[PDB]
Each structure stands twice: as structure tokens, then as C-alpha cells.
Amino acid sequence: SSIEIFPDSDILVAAAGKRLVGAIGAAVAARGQALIVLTGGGNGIALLRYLSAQAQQIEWSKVHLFWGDERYVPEDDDERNLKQARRALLNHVDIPSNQVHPMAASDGDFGGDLDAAALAYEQVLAASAAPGDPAPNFDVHLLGMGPEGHINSLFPHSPAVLESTRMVVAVDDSPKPPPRRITLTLPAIQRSREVWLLVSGPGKADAVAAAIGGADPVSVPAAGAVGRQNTLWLLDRDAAAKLP
């Protein structure tokens, strides 16, 4: 468990970027694949653009991509985490499409049955896992965090953050638009070897401090965002200002 502080989000993003490049290379060398969980949010998307500039250092044929959450809106909508990832990275690197695993869109197979869409993604994770595991042991789960400490689409005092069995659940009721999302749960996040939170800005500072101070994840979800081998808070100065 570590905190690394940078002057701003640009430097933060580039630092995460080079670290992920090494993390991917390491995972390929040891295991012949790198299992990476992507996030939406400005820092998450900027990190993807960084990877795009380094594409030559990354053996894309061996990279496998999942999402921590997704907005349940139409496929071509700008609020889609997948679409933003496509523009930032996917449309311009040679990753095999059968190794890219997106969550469903609202105009896909499942309509109003959001639970079915989450369960479908869960089946995908189970299939992607090593034998006998509910999901991959993700090399890196990337995260942003909202001003209230939410990660993926796991909000304070929500049914989604209380989930202790399912890898993926429906979020019907997000207090931040769009209202419907599909999300990985804390147990899913906690399978990751490493979890990295990329958090910048004075609006996130109080939540950061409470999360690092050991708050109940039902109150500050980011507190449950803990990797099996490490947990890396990558912060700008403003996001760090309330730490002791």
C-alpha cells in the first residue's frame, strides 16, 4: 500500500503510463498475457492516450482488456466508457478484438433487464478466469474516484457496494447521471494483483483522506479498493492536501 504525489494530473498520468507499460511487460514475461481493467474518467482516459504514444513498448497481442464499470446508454454515446477507450486507444492499436471484453450497452441484447446484462458480463469474467476462479486475477485494475469516494459505479450506501459474492452487478440508481451502469464489485476489485487509483483535484481531497484513514467502504467505497499485492494511490498535490 503506497501513496505517490505529483504536481499535477499530466505528470501523474505519465507516471502511471510508464508504470503500466512495465507492469504489462512483466505480466507477459511471467504469464504470456496481461489482464488489465480499464476505467472511464479523465485520468483513466488520459492514461490510455499515454499508452497510445508508447504502443511500440507494448506487446498488444498479449494484452486482455476488461472494464471496471460502464454506463448503460446507447453503444455510440459519448458517455460510453468503451467508446472513450476506442478513441483514446483501441481504434489505433493492434489488440485482437476477441481479447477486448466490453460491458453491454442499453441498446444491446438485454433492454431494461440490466441485471441480465451484468450477469452476462459475469459469465465472460468466469470464462476468462484461470480454472476454478470467479474472474481473472487482474494484473492491474485502474480506478478513478469521485468526490464522495465512489469507484467503478460503487456509490456510498448503495446495494452495489454491499455485494460480497457477485463479480458484477446492476446499478439502477446512480446519484450521478447517467442513472444506469454495470459495475465490478469490491470482491472483483480485490482479486486484482494491483489496484491503482488516479486521483487529482481539490474536490477529491477529503474523500482521499477518509479512504486512506480507514473509513468503512459502505461510506467511502474507495476504502475497499485494495489489491492482493498492492494498492497505489496516484495523487496530484491538490488531491493530497487533506492527508495528515
Swiss-Prot record:
One of its GO terms (biological process) is carbohydrate metabolic process. One of its GO terms (molecular function) is 6-phosphogluconolactonase activity. Keywords: Hydrolase. The keyword rRNA-binding does not apply. It catalyses: 6-phospho-D-glucono-1,5-lactone + H2O = 6-phospho-D-gluconate + H(+). The keyword Translocase does not apply. Disulfide bonds: none annotated. Pathway: Carbohydrate degradation; pentose phosphate pathway; D-ribulose 5-phosphate from D-glucose 6-phosphate (oxidative stage): step 2/3. CDD domains: 6PGL. Its EC number is 3.1.1.31. Hydrolysis of 6-phosphogluconolactone to 6-phosphogluconate. This is 6-phosphogluconolactonase.
